[PDB]
Amino acid sequence: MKQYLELMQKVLDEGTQKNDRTGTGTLSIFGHQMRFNLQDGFPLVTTKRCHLRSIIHELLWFLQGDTNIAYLHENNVTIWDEWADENGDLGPVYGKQWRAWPTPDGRHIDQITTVLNQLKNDPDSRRIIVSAWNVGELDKMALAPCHAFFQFYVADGKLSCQLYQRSCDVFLGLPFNIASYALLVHMMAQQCDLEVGDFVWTGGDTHLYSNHMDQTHLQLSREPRPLPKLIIKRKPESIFDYRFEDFEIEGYDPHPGIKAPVAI
Amino acid sequence: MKQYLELMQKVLDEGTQKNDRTGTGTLSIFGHQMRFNLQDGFPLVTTKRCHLRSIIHELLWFLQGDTNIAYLHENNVTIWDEWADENGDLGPVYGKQWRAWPTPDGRHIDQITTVLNQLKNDPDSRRIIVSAWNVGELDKMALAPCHAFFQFYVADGKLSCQLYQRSCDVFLGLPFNIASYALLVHMMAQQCDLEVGDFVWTGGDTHLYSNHMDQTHLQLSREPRPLPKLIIKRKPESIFDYRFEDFEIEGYDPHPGIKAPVAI
Numbered sequence A, B: 001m002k003q004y005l006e007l008m009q010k011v012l013d014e015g016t017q018k019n020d021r022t023g024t025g026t027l028s029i030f031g032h033q034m035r036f037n038l039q040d041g042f043p044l045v046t047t048k049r050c051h052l053r054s055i056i057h058e059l060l061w062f063l064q065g066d067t068n069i070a071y072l073h074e075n076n077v078t079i080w081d082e083w084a085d086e087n088g089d090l091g092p093v094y095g096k097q098w099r100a101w102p103t104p105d106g107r108h109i110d111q112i113t114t115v116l117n118q119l120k121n122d123p124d125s126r127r128i129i130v131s132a133w134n135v136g137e138l139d140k141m142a143l144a145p146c147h148a149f150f151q152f153y154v155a156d157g158k159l160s161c162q163l164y165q166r167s168c169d170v171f172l173g174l175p176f177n178i179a180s181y182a183l184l185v186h187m188m189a190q191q192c193d194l195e196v197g198d199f200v201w202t203g204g205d206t207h208l209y210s211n212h213m214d215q216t217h218l219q220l221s222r223e224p225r226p227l228p229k230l231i232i233k234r235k236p237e238s239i240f241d242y243r244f245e246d247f248e249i250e251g252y253d254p255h256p257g258i259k260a261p262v263a264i
């Protein structure tokens, strides 16, 4: 997509060298923002083929509050394999915090349920937020949340979402992250009888891994294509009742997929 | 400042009329980002006279972990009066979350010390975060945190910080927010023997109150003056040991103050 490729090019051009957690090294910038008007099309990158399969199942998995990879495996999704323990557990990552954020008194908070009720009852609220950044549970997580903090907003019958992504693997992660949140906006909009607005993406440490440079030059050599259209085929009873088969992407015409190794 | 006036004009150009919690009404956009290179000068609005004294005392108050207005009153700062209970308490707002985030297992995390040690020991970490958005304690707070989530970054010996401000009263709040975080970057940088980088400001619901419009137009008619310069006179042994008289602002030549009512 134009803004995605612009970001890639910017990291290449302006990023500074970082030694990082993984020992791989990156080129990195700090602070970026992009805006995707979801009525212009579904923001699935077209300069490499992205598999919506993994994106969809990961999102449904988050929504069901699951942090064990068994569900993902049932659906042939292997994207979380490198960080799961012997029992397939990741600890209290994304899903757990979205659906069951724990408090010291032993209670749990369902942020997604809160958000739906906020959108339906108080759409003008400036407090329609989900955080995965549960400081007190970081030490138990396989990875600290990358897509850490997000907000919804409603105007003129349209639902927008902004994500604060503290850490972004521009090549591997970002295409997924953008599509995932765009999908979520479509789902919540449907449940709330709203139209879709913008997805606003904000990055913190926004980087290209040193071992993704060939892949980056290959992708940058490619021109984007018009965005596909998301079709939701069935409206379920609640935001927690979607299934993979509910979603179709029409008019997705990508360039070929590009393979690159993940930094562990 | 140019960035600040440009934001005001962006709200005017793109914003939509929204009802709000306070019953005042706003003109609102969703999603913005701007940058202040702190080496250019200290980003205190010059197109109206701002009260650095309140800004400084508020930040020292946060850093102490305090959430009661007594200290503010002792220093003739009244900016939190409208939300405090009969005993002066705001509940577990910023200060508390910054210094003593409660974990589910009964620990407390001092996020400010955590970040200081991360910057000293592992500045290329992508996890150098402070969150005030403690989902389990929101209900106890007089207001939900506006300046909600922030991240530090280091490159070429310079400390940067990005704030995600979920809700922004552009006329009243934002000048304070920008100056407060800029001060914090300087303090943090001092403690870490770093130079200052950028403060990156990102907004969620970014708005002008209905009853700030006269004031906004007036301010927009004015040319920014040179940025003032911040001089820190002392290096305390701890980030929690700064005093009011450690800070001086030099060369601040603002246009006249502009009064406006706060929405409760």
Ligand SMILES: Nc1nc2c(c(=O)[nH]1)N[C@H](CNc1ccc(C(=O)N[C@@H](CCC(=O)O)C(=O)O)cc1)CN2
Binding pocket: A022, A051, A054, A078, A079, A143, A169, A172, A173, A174, A176, A258, A259, A260, A262, A263, A264
């Ligand atoms: N450093 C590092 N980078 C990352 C993650 C990490 O934790 N570490 N986690 C992220 C979470 N998202 C993804 C997205 C895609 C893949 C992936 O590997 N994708 C393949 C193959 C897709 C598939 O499995 O079918 C591709 O070429 O697009 C891995 C993590 C992305 N980047």
Ligand SMILES: Nc1nc2c(c(=O)[nH]1)N[C@H](CNc1ccc(C(=O)N[C@@H](CCC(=O)O)C(=O)O)cc1)CN2
Binding pocket: B050, B051, B054, B078, B079, B080, B143, B169, B172, B173, B174, B176, B258, B259, B260, B262, B263, B264
């Ligand atoms: N709706 C609204 N509510 C708020 C804030 C806001 O931003 N807008 N911010 C709060 C904390 N910060 C401030 C910052 C500035 C002011 C303010 O009122 N400032 C005046 C008067 C300052 C003074 O006391 O001298 C000014 O002219 O700058 C009040 C609360 C709490 N609630």
Ligand SMILES: *[C@H]1[C@@H]([N+](=O)[O-])C(=O)NC(=O)N1[C@H]1C[C@H](O)[C@@H](COP(=O)(O)O)O1
Binding pocket: A021, A022, A143, A144, A145, A146, A147, A167, A168, A169, A170, A172, A173, A174, A177, B126, B127
């Ligand atoms: C992390 C990620 N995730 O773990 O789910 C995601 O959704 N997107 C990412 O881009 N992502 C990246 C950022 C970074 O390259 C690593 C995480 O490492 P740390 O920043 O060191 O935690 O994965």
Ligand SMILES: *[C@H]1[C@@H]([N+](=O)[O-])C(=O)NC(=O)N1[C@H]1C[C@H](O)[C@@H](COP(=O)(O)O)O1
Binding pocket: A126, A127, B021, B022, B143, B144, B145, B146, B147, B167, B168, B169, B170, B172, B173, B174, B177
């Ligand atoms: C809130 C605020 N604070 O309460 O500390 C701050 O520091 N900056 C603000 O701009 N600020 C504003 C945003 C909004 O106009 C109100 C808070 O109201 P809600 O968004 O309804 O919670 O204060």
